[PDB]
Design a protein around this ligand. Structure first.
Ligand SMILES: O=C(O)[C@@H](CNC(=O)[C@@H]1C[C@@H]2CC[C@H]1C21CC1)Oc1ccccc1
Length: 357
């Protein structure tokens, strides 16, 4: 519909110009159907255009897959958010871990686990040593500090009862049921032709390996698969696998509140209608990566349909954004191979979705 076309082109054209974005793909999900848009270059040097089959690094949008996979493990009865972390990692004997649950890890509330795992932390024994030596700044369940080392550990522990690797669990329990057949934690050689380069300060870059990278920022996907991901989270009851349907719902439950935002598993939520300044200004890393006190939602509120549900994501060379409103059957995916500022992403998305609702 030309409505959607005009709204998308009027918003995204100046965005690409202002932010000097080499390549971009957008999907609008409207009344149960996807509409796709593409611009510019997946590979500047080889003049490869962005297409609907181009793979982008999702970066920290990957945490929404980790949260849903954890939700599925809960639904299967393999894990409980109320479980002690030591239940699944008994070698974690240092006393500061008493009272830190899987809920705390999944929601960044364990007491100040760091944003990044240190570069020097490679092996399973390096990781154990790192968490054993870590000293919390706050008591558990009092402060939120967005952190790869928190939900990354949640994801690694959540798959342990299944006996599967994190990648294998993700493939079998999330990607394959939802027909995300071009979504990868490790891009296979046969798919490299579609893997866009990211651009950082003009240099072509791909994400480098890191501990817990798959769990915190490691998924790559196409605009078509990401539209399917949005539709799956918009309407979980259409999903025929029972524990996956349940796990999607659990990831949109409201566990903590800070300001006007609610923390789910990976996803973040606000009541719809939102104040746009709240979500735009709130997506700035100055707010999004800051330590903030949280109020427990006791017990957590089940997924609220009248919500703005969203997640920003980045790697060194890529910037992504996903947002949807279940009440309105409406969503958007924006995938770019430049890590450009979060408020510009959310501003564009709110202009498009507000116009269409
Ligand atoms: O290793 C990487 O290339 C990735 C992996 N992405 C993350 O870790 C996330 C992205 C940034 C950093 C923490 C999370 C974030 C606040 C949104 O991102 C980087 C690293 C260096 C510079 C910019 C991005």
């Amino acid at each position: 519909p030309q409505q959607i076309n005009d709204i998308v082109h009027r918003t995204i054209t100046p965005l690409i110009e202002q932010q000097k974005i080499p390549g971009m793909a957008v999907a609008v999900i409207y009344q149960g159907k996807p509409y796709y848009f593409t611009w510019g270059y997946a590979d500047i040097a080889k003049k490869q255009p962005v297409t609907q089959q181009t793979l982008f690094e999702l970066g920290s949008v990957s945490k929404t897959f980790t949260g849903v996979l954890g939700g599925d493990a809960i639904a299967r009865g393999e894990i409980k958010l109320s479980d002690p972390t030591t239940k699944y990692w008994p070698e974690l004997t240092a006393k500061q871990w008493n009272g830190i649950t899987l809920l705390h890890l999944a929601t960044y509330t364990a007491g100040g686990l760091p944003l990044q795992v240190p570069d020097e932390v490679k092996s399973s024994s390096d990781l154990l040593r790192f968490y054993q030596n870590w000293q919390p700044a706050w008591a558990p369940g009092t402060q939120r500090l967005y952190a790869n080392s928190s939900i990354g550990l949640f994801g690694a522990l959540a798959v342990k009862p299944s006996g599967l690797s994190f990648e294998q669990a993700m493939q079998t329990r999330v990607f394959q049921p939802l027909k995300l057949n071009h979504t990868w934690i490790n891009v296979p050689p046969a798919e490299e032709k579609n893997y866009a380069w990211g651009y950082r300060e003009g240099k072509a870059v791909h994400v480098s390996p890191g501990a817990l990278d798959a769990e915190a920022y490691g998924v790559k996907s196409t605009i078509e698969d990401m539209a399917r991901w949005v539709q799956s989270n918009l309407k979980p009851l259409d999903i025929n696998e029972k524990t996956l349907q349940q796990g999607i719902q659990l990831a949109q439950s409201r566990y903590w509140q800070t300001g006007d935002m609610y923390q789910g598993l990976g996803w973040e939520m606000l009541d719809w209608p939102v104040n746009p300044d709240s979500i735009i200004n709130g997506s700035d890393n100055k707010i999004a990566l800051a330590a903030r006190p949280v109020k427990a939602i006791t017990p957590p509120t089940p997924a609220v349909r009248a919500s703005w549900v969203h997640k920003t994501g980045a790697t060194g060379g890529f910037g992504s954004y996903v947002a949807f409103i279940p009440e309105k059957e409406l969503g958007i995916v924006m995938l770019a191979n430049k890590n450009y500022p979060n408020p510009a992403r959310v501003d564009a998305a709110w202009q498009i979705l507000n116009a269409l609702q």
